[PDB]
Amino acid sequence: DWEQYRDRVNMLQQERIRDSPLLQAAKENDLRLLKILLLNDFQQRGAVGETALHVAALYDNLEAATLLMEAAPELAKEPALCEPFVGQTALHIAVMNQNLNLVRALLARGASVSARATGAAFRRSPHNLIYYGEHPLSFAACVGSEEIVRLLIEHGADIRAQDSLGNTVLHILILQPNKTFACQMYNLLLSYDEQSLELVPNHQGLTPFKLAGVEGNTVMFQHLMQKRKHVQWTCGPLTSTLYDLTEIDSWGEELSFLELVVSSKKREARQILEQTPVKELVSFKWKKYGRPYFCVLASLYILYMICFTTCCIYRPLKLRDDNRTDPRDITILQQKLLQEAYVTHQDNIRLVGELVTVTGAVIILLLEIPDIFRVGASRYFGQTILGGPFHVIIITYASLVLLTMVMRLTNMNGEVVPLSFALVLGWCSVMYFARGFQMLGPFTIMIQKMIFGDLMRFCWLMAVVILGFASAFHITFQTEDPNNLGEFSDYPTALFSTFELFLTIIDGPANYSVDLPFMYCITYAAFAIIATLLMLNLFIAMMGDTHWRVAQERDELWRAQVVATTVMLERKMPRFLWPRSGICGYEYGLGDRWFLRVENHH
Amino acid sequence: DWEQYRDRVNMLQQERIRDSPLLQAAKENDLRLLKILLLNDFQQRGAVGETALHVAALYDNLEAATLLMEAAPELAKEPALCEPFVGQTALHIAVMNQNLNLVRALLARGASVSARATGAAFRRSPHNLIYYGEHPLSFAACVGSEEIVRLLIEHGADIRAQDSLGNTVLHILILQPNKTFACQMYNLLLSYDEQSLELVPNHQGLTPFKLAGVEGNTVMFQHLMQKRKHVQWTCGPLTSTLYDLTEIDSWGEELSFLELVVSSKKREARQILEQTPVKELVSFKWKKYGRPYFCVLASLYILYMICFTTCCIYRPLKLRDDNRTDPRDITILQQKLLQEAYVTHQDNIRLVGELVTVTGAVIILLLEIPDIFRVGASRYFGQTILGGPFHVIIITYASLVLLTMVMRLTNMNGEVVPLSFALVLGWCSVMYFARGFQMLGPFTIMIQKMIFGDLMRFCWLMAVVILGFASAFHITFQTEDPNNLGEFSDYPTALFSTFELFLTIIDGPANYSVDLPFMYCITYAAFAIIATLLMLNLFIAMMGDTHWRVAQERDELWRAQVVATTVMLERKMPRFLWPRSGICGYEYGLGDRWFLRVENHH
Ligand SMILES: CC(C)[C@@H](C)/C=C/[C@@H](C)[C@H]1CC[C@H]2C3=CC=C4C[C@@H](O)CC[C@]4(C)[C@H]3CC[C@]12C
Ligand SMILES: CC(C)[C@@H](C)/C=C/[C@@H](C)[C@H]1CC[C@H]2C3=CC=C4C[C@@H](O)CC[C@]4(C)[C@H]3CC[C@]12C
Ligand SMILES: CC(C)[C@@H](C)/C=C/[C@@H](C)[C@H]1CC[C@H]2C3=CC=C4C[C@@H](O)CC[C@]4(C)[C@H]3CC[C@]12C
Ligand SMILES: CC(C)[C@@H](C)/C=C/[C@@H](C)[C@H]1CC[C@H]2C3=CC=C4C[C@@H](O)CC[C@]4(C)[C@H]3CC[C@]12C
Question: Nearest chain A Cα to B140, which residue?
Fold first, then answer.
């Protein structure tokens, strides 16, 4: 376990500090015994691998630290050695504690300004509570001190230093939860930059602009957009602003800014889409091109669904050759063969309809299966922003249509099974296009939240109630005639009848001409009290609570779904139908950049 | 597109400012190169059509503006020429920026005080963020400056100047969203008025009083009612106020104040009906005359509905001459002819009842069809204040009754179709009279909001669910005997049965004497989980959320419906049954005005 190993490391470090007298005197700033010991091994290390100067920097002992840098000047260069803190120097712990004079004394003794703390306690992990980087400059930028940052820069710290994750100091500053003073430190560190430091990619390929978009740092995004705007004029309450769309539109890039924002796992990333360039950019993209193309694609999919349904209704069936020996058997028709089916003109119309259906199912798999590999199977099917479960049911519908096609070509009986699954899933996949409308999109998201929410727990306890009462009903009617009351004659029939009686979609089985057992009456009274009266209306109460508790999240989810649909439509549709958004700067002498003009009222 | 043209105009204006050195020096207030250029074309124009003095007034450059009015005194008279800003002078941009000394210097050089900015960026449009008028006096009244208003008036600006929309400066002041300081500017501009400026109509025929009523400017209405009130006395906590009803009652006018207020498309116009004269005026009108007349009209309509229903029940039917050849055919009666029907005394009673029904349907079309033309088909049927959908179903009911009348006179079979539509619509039109009661009016409005709200989206996804499961059920029972389970024998029958099974108004089809396919069991279990359990109760949860989220709007909608019903009853009923409201001033020597007395407690 990671917690037990870190706990053992911490108590071992404290124990080896306690056993060593030099480490103890560096811990509680005991000057007298320090002078006695330094007058009388100075490079002894603890369990972490740290020196006594590390202990003095850890416990904020300035006098003790100056004492052992006077006695041992080389002690200000050695880092810790063992795994959880390897690379940590005394400069790192002095910078973390914001001790200005200790940092000055360490830099006077020869502390490295580019020491890399590559330990496991400094990586960006859920194990670590903080992620301040690996360099002392990143640590000083993240603790919140200006003066140690200027001191480290004037002593020769690399501003463009990258850690093991590839993050520069700008990336680590953006990854902080302060979100307000990090802009001041960003301005301070950009003052010393004058390629740019703002265009140095991450190991994930992210600029600091793209990292601020992904992590949902809205204040940092607004601060970054100040340097990319230009106020054209201000006339009274009206002002015209010219936002740069180079980093935002990301034309020609395989992974754009908006694609990374709408496919981010953070809940705060959807608030980037409501900012001052981005909201009107995606609104213009949706109003001018996204909505009509989504509407005609929805119309084409509805026509394709109508064609598939009409091919399902007119499927080839012949009269059953085998006689109905069993009285309970009611099958009078059976499937036709390959040569027996397509012999008429209506069969040729159904043939071209089925060819259109198979062509549409192949086209569906040519558009979805590449999209799993570009993003990932966890994000393509798990993110409701991109249309997660809808892609699952669409891929399943295409697979079932191809299974029915090879069933037809192989002449296997039982086409009704994949045709029924394909019909239900393909028709329920038309709700994917509901996200393009304000009337239906939030309701579809609420359906998605209720299916994976209240319905799952309700069905989980419903299985228990239905199993118990179905077993009780089946053992109650195990001694009676199944002709007079056949709801509980067989145990699967008892389970189905009890499920239907819970949902009250069938009547309570009562035959007044005969004498039912009293155990059925008592068990069904309890079933009607607990299942019908209590549980079926408690589901309505629970969904009524959960409906108003997630309505705001539902609206923001729908807005981000509209933006992600716009991004998907711009990525997949041809370029000649999706012109580049914004105003071209080459027509007006502003270089090769594209801008978006916003006129606001203050 | 209007946004792209305005964006191109703005970037072209900035580009032509950037290319020209005179426009550039007027932009960033470069005095040195300005003196060099003026010592060395001065009337050059940009893309907008503006001079360099326009640029100096736009970028608030006082010294630059004084420089080119010293060099070119005629430059302070030329307006912009091209379409989006035609008529805009430098005085307009100086007034917009609230530059007092620049306005003084322009007026010293000979700037026109009555320049009309007839461009497309100054009209009252949703394209423009502001509507400040076309004259510099309206601009100075709307930016919020007293001093430039007094300066422009003392320099000879017309206070009664009207723009292309016909609005005076009072109208444009009322159309501002400040709503508090606009009263101070209204008092300032009325101080210089002393026909009155307050009685100058709009091109829509509106006074500033009527414009404040239409736009829902409640603070401006309260400020306007201070000049039309008169405190008779004040005795302790009791004070008696005498409000003038000349502008409010609008006796003799075809388009009154209250009719314009209740038929306004703004949501804030319904708050005018709660103000200090208007609320008690419409309350006295409703309590004294509106409620009893509405009650007796509702009673007459209920009696007419009873007569029409009784004529529908006793309709002439004869025994079917053709034999029932088809076993499924159950039609045993058919319609009588014209000469065959009215042969008895009960047939004569039904004849006079049907004549009363046709007379009522003709009277209905004589009262509604004129009212569409006076207001408009979008507002008569779209505004729930006036009874929008109720007029639609009433006109449809009258049309269906006349269609049944010509069907009877033409002897066409199939009267049951328009008689069924007419019965349902005419009986559901009795809910129009529910607005006169506190118990039923808000509930009727909530029904209207739920029909066009949650029910529409629920039915839109319900069509998808029912279509998919109906197709699955029909292909499941395509091979079985239709005698033992005929719910899904035909595809329209499968669609109807699946809709009924979703709403659980029929039982789940189960025949325990025969063996149903397992695909029906799996598909119906999924149908009962998704449609019956999830969706049918999620509709209740969604309507429970939407009920409490619009309840206040429901109450205000009902109050405005009561006021609009009072206005309609006063307009349509004869004058001898609706006496003029208020206290006549001729009986007490106060001229020919009518007043309403309000006694309040402070
Ligand atoms: C007998 C078979 C056909 C079984 C497996 C039935 C499955 C259907 C009824 C279920 C399986 C997964 C379901 C499902 C998953 C997720 C969503 C997203 C939501 O926003 C709209 C509804 C929607 C689309 C629903 C509709 C109902 C579906 C499609
Ligand atoms: C608890 C949740 C997950 C819901 C969906 C479960 C419902 C159970 C009670 C339902 C769903 C599918 C049903 C079902 C499907 C098909 C058949 C085949 C039929 O010839 C005998 C009954 C039988 C075996 C029934 C029994 C009851 C089942 C198992
Ligand atoms: C088979 C036919 C008769 C079809 C078309 C039925 C239509 C009826 C049921 C529908 C059509 C329009 C509906 C309708 C529209 C608007 C309103 C306003 C609301 O505040 C009260 C209910 C009311 C009055 C409802 C009642 C139900 C009506 C009248
Ligand atoms: C989705 C919303 C808008 C609601 C109202 C739609 C409901 C559908 C499922 C209903 C409404 C009217 C129904 C309907 C009306 C009349 C007939 C004639 C009958 O001889 C065969 C069934 C048939 C054809 C059914 C089929 C199911 C329909 C089409």
Answer: A236
Residue-by-residue DSSP string for B441-461: HHHHHHHHHHHTTHHHHHHHH
User: Which one-letter amino acid corresponds to residue A363?
Assistant: I
Residue nearest to atom 15 of ligand 2 (CA): B522
How is B287-308 classified by DSSP, letter by letter? Answer: IIIIHHHHHHHHHHHHHHHHHH
* Token couple for A401: 């249509």
Rg (CA), chain B: 35
* A539 chain-B contacts, CB cut-off 8 A: 533, 537
Find out whether A507 is annotated in a ligand binding site. yes
Q: How far apart are CA A263 and CA A278, in angstroms?
A: 16
Using only the alpha carbons of chain A, give its radius of gyration: 35
d(CA B325, CA B244): 79
Residue B111 CA to residue B89 CA, distance in Å, equals 8
For ligand 4, the distance from its centroid to the CA atom of residue B490, given in whole angstroms, is 13
The answer for residues whose C-beta is within 8 angstroms of residue A45's C-beta and 6 or more apart is A51, A80, A81
Q: What is the CB neighbour count within 10 angstroms for residue B194? A: 6
Interhelix angle for A136-143 vs A147-154, to 10°? 160
Integer Cα distance of A397 and A425 in angstroms: 6
Which one of B464, B485, B532 has the shortest CB-CB distance to A431?
B464
Cα–Cα distance measured from residue B452 to residue B448, given in angstroms and rounded to the nearest whole number:
6
Residue type, B209: F
Q: How many CB atoms lie within 10 A of CB B360?
A: 20
**Token pair belonging to A445:** 């998201």
Task: List the determination method.
Answer: cryo-EM
Please report how the helices A291-313 and A345-375 are oriented relative to each other, as an axis angle in degrees rounded to 10. 130
Q: Which residues sit directly before a break in chain B (C to N > 2.5 Å)?
A: 40, 194
DSSP label at residue A413: S
Please name the residue of chain B whose CA is at the shortest distance from the CA of residue A439.
B457
CA pair distance B434, B430, nearest whole angstrom: 7
Q: Is the shortest distance between the CB of B462 and ligand 4 below 6 Å?
A: yes
Cα dist. B49→A91, A302, B46, B57, B153 in Å? 64, 52, 5, 14, 28
**Which tokens hold the place of A29?**
């700033």
Q: Is B515 part of the contact surface with chain A (CB cutoff 8 Å)?
A: yes
**CA angle A329-A332-A336, nearest 5°?**
130
Return the best residue to mutate from A460, A495, A497, A503 for the ligand 2 pocket (most ligand atoms within 8 A of CB): A495
DSSP assignments along A311-358, one per residue: HHHT--EEE-SS---STT--B-EEE--HHHHTTSHHHHHHHHHHHHHH
Q: Which whole-number Å values give the CA distances from B466 to A541, B37, B181, B266, in the listed order?
A: 25, 78, 58, 39
Tokens representing residue B37 in the block: 């250029």
What CA dihedral angle connects B348, B353, B358 and B359, to 10 degrees? 110
CA end-to-end distance (rounded Å), chain B: 56
In CATH terms, the superfamily for domain B3-244 is: Ankyrin repeat-containing domain (1.25.40.20)
Resolution of this entry, Å: 3.0
- In three-state secondary structure terms, A108 is helix
Q: Is A393 in the pocket of ligand 1 (CB under 6 A)?
A: yes
Nearest to A451 among B523, B526, B534 (CB): B534
Identify whether the C-beta of residue A363 lies closer than 8 Å to the C-beta of residue A352.
no
Q: For B10, which of A451, A543, A597 is closest by C-beta distance?
A: A597
Beta bridge partners of B598: B241
Helices marked H in A376-415 — which ranges? 377-382, 388-410
Structure tokens at A8: 């053992």
Closest listed residue to residue A524, CA positions, set A544, A493, A502, A546: A502
